[PDB]
Design a protein around this ligand. Structure first.
Ligand SMILES: C[C@@H](C[C@H](C[C@@H](CCC(=O)O)C(=O)O)C(=O)O)C(=O)O
Ligand SMILES: [Zn+2]
Length: 308
């Protein structure tokens, strides 16, 4: 509202309200938080990433994104909560302070702004970007099928109208290319966590093929530790495994690409629930979802911190 302390974290917000929150959080924490514009969407909206840092030069970092699929509202709502949580816990909570004293955190709360705006104005269930496709009347590309990892292979659709349309070519969507450019420019991302809903799952590579990733044992043990931490709060049960075994085959997905780039701790979350409400999760579950998810994120960040 007028400050991030008066902001209502227990309700769903519009794009403008979240963008205003970004500016308020930065103004209130000028030496801890920075707002970086990594690009502009298809429709021209700025794409923002929040940088949380306590100093250093090109420190190893954790990347977290929410809302790549616009209709998964509990993710952007959780992202806003995570942002505030970082500013509340740094310097107060021993464990988190340790994390941020060595690692920087980059958080993209609304990874698909055009889609988010559309879920408020026209279609609550919109998933894709809002770009046009030459030769078609159908709008949008599935941003989670647009990455250059098994691009265009089984696990994606070539039909522009499909919810899983992969696009003309890898990185065709500016929302995806902006992240790709950022990751390459930064060059020191150690963990990359892309958050979705729903299903209650914590997954690692790969989604496009059944071959296990070289670091399967470590990532699987880390996943078990993370879901155990998550369950400790409210008892919420999450299953885990590779994308392909835990949910289904998906090509051109984010973490298959980030992992191929050398970011070992590449994970994707599927938050509450398992389908009762699905994408339409009640607002009263935003904070509980964010709180339990944060415990799992802390598990991954600490593991990352301790395995340089
Ligand atoms: C329940 C949801 C699952 C779906 C899974 C997701 C693959 C797994 C992941 O990257 O988290 C995908 O892009 O299809 C999602 O969160 O977009 C859906 O059916 O849209
Ligand atoms: Zn999704």
């Amino acid at each position: 509202a007028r400050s991030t302390d008066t902001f209502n974290y227990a309700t769903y917000h519009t794009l403008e309200e979240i963008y205003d929150f970004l500016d308020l959080l930065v103004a209130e924490n000028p030496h801890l938080v920075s707002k970086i514009q990594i690009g502009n969407t298809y429709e021209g909206r700025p794409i923002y990433v929040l940088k949380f840092s306590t100093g250093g030069s090109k420190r190893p970092a954790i990347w977290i994104d929410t809302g790549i699929h616009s209709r998964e509202w509990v993710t952007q709502a959780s992202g806003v909560w995570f942002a505030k949580k970082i500013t509340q816990d740094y310097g107060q909570d021993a464990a988190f302070t340790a994390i941020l004293d060595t690692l920087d955190i980059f958080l993209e709360i609304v990874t698909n702004p055009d889609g988010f705006a559309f879920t408020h104005s026209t279609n609550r269930m919109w998933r894709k970007t809002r770009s046009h496709t030459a030769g078609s009347l159908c709008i949008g590309v599935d941003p989670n099928r647009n990455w250059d990892a098994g691009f265009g292979l089984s696990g994606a659709s070539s039909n522009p109208c499909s919810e899983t349309y992969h696009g003309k070519f890898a990185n065709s969507e500016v929302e995806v290319k902006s992240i790709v450019d950022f990751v390459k420019d930064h060059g020191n991302i150690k963990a990359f966590i892309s958050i979705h809903s729903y299903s209650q799952l914590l997954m690692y590579p790969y989604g496009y093929k059944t071959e296990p990733v070289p670091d399967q044992d470590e990532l699987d043990q880390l996943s078990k530790a993370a879901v155990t931490a998550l369950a400790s709060l409210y008892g919420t049960k999450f299953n885990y495994g590779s994308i392909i075994k835990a949910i289904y085959q998906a090509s051109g997905s984010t973490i298959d690409w980030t992992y191929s780039q050398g970011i070992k701790y590449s994970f994707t979350f599927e938050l509450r629930d398992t389908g009762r409400y699905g994408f339409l999760l009640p607002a009263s579950q935003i904070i509980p979802t964010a709180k339990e998810t944060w415990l799992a994120l802390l598990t991954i960040m600490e593991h990352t911190l301790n395995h340089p």
